[PDB]
């Protein structure tokens, strides 16, 4: 099976730039094809940027022909993306690929082009403020707020708890992220067994368990 | 240079029926080639050359097209077809351009939300910041409205929605809306309320928690 793995470095400061790498597995980058690498903006617009052929030449996307190079190192298997004078623009999903016909893609990397800080996620429980009527179900939950950058990893009772979970998608608070997950687990096991939220965040190593308790009284 | 334009832009259909979408060349193409998408995964190879499918691909799919005008079908939609599906073109290179997709979402019941609405923690006070989190989950169709009431009357400001798309098992929406406040603001105040409106009921789902509690 052929294989395509890009990588490279995840934040980058405006004006900088980039390079990503594509490592690719079980066919040689010399011997046939075209390799490609294609850019994923947030909402779901695909770019072509530019390939290189088996043989050495390079063609790129005229938009990006003056800011991107494609460049490659046979010896370890390697072809990369180099992205000079980053803008904030160029925010998006890095996926390499195999070419003609677009088969074989690599899983994507993400690259994200701010002045913003690798802050780590402040987590709180959420609990019930009493209410009224209902029914049978309780819903607690996480509040994951304030870190940067995207992602965290929210997952409850260490990944027992799978069914009843909505990791609710990230967004923006300022200029850092807020998420939050919510689990609907039945009254009567609460809290005689025990819920808890475990967070997670690669980009600051941060990894902390919360139990969510009744609350207050 | 050459502009895909594709049709249907959401499309929602029920396992066992038929499906057509549409791609359409703004000037005449090679050959077009389409993808499948789902949420976190990358773009996976369907048709190529207009009409030749992929190898790992059911041949409930097909595509289609004469020069400028295109089409995939799925014959009969499976429910791990919901996805969404990109065309692309080769022409005389200017450069490679793709569409920008037609969404595919299943069919299923009317569910009404299960509304849910939670106080700032004690942990979350210490820092100055106070967030009231409204959870409306599990409902369909996906057209909700939140309104936010802080004692009484009805606030915009500070509201923060966010929306799943479709459930991976049940096939519903779910969405989180957070009001954030400061300390001092929120401690000014005594009535928080949530309230939703879905389709299927005219009369609100309002969840209420009010300051004095325990
Ligand atoms: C290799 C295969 C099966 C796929 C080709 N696809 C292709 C072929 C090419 N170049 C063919 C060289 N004249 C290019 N290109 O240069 O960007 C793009 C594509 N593509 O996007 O699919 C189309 C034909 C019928 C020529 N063939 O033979």
């Known amino acids: 099976d052929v294989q395509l793995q890009e990588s490279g470095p995840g934040l980058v400061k405006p004006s900088q730039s980039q390079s990503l790498t594509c490592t690719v597995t079980g066919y040689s980058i010399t011997s046939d094809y075209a390799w490609n690498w294609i850019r994923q903006f947030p909402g779901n617009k695909l770019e072509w940027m530019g390939y290189?052929?088996?043989?050495?030449?390079?063609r790129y996307n005229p938009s990006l022909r003056s800011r991107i190079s494609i460049t490659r190192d046979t010896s370890k298997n390697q072809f990369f993306l180099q992205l000079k004078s980053v803008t904030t623009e160029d925010t998006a999903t890095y996926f390499c690929?195999?070419?003609?016909?677009?088969?074989?893609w690599g899983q994507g990397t993400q690259v994200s082009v701010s002045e913003a800080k690798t802050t780590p996620p402040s987590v709180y429980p959420l609990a019930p403020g009493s209410a009224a009527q209902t029914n049978s179900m309780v819903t607690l939950g996480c509040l994951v707020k304030g870190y940067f950058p995207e992602p965290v990893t929210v997952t409850w009772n260490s990944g027992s708890l799978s069914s009843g979970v909505h990791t609710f998608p990230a967004v923006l608070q300022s200029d850092l992220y807020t998420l939050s997950s919510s689990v609907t687990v039945p009254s009567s096991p609460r809290p005689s067994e025990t819920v808890t939220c475990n967070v997670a965040h690669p980009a600051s190593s941060t990894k902390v368990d919360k139990k969510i308790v009744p609350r207050d009284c | 240079q050459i502009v895909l334009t594709q049709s249907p832009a959401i499309m929602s259909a029920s396992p066992g029926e038929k499906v057509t979408m549409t791609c359409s060349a703004s000037?005449?193409?090679?050959?077009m080639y389409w993808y499948q998408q789902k949420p976190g995964s990358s773009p996976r190879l369907l048709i190529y050359?207009?009409?030749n499918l992929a190898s790992g691909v059911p041949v409930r799919f097909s595509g289609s097209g004469s020069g400028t005008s295109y089409s995939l079908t799925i014959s009969r939609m499976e429910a791990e077809d919901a996805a969404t599906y990109y065309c692309?073109?080769?022409?005389?290179?200017?450069?490679?351009?793709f569409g920008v997709g037609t969404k595919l979402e299943l069919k299923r019941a009317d569910a009404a939300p299960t509304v849910s609405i939670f106080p700032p923690s004690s942990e979350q006070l210490t820092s100055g910041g106070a967030s009231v989190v409204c959870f409306l989950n599990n409902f369909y169709p996906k057209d909700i409205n939140v309104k936010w009431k802080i004692d009484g009357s009805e606030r915009q400001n500070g509201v923060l929605n966010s929306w799943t798309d479709q459930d991976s098992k049940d096939s519903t929406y779910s969405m989180s809306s957070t009001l954030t406040l400061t300390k001092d603001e929120y401690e000014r105040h005594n009535s928080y309320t949530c309230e939703a409106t879905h389709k299927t009921s005219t009369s609100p789902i309002v969840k209420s928690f009010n300051r004095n509690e325990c």
């Open positions: 692309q073109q080769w022409s005389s290179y200017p450069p490679i351009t």
């Open positions: 000037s005449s193409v090679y050959y």
């Open positions: 290189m052929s088996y043989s050495g030449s390079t």
């Open positions: 690929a195999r070419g003609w016909p677009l088969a074989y």
């Open positions: 050359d207009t009409s």
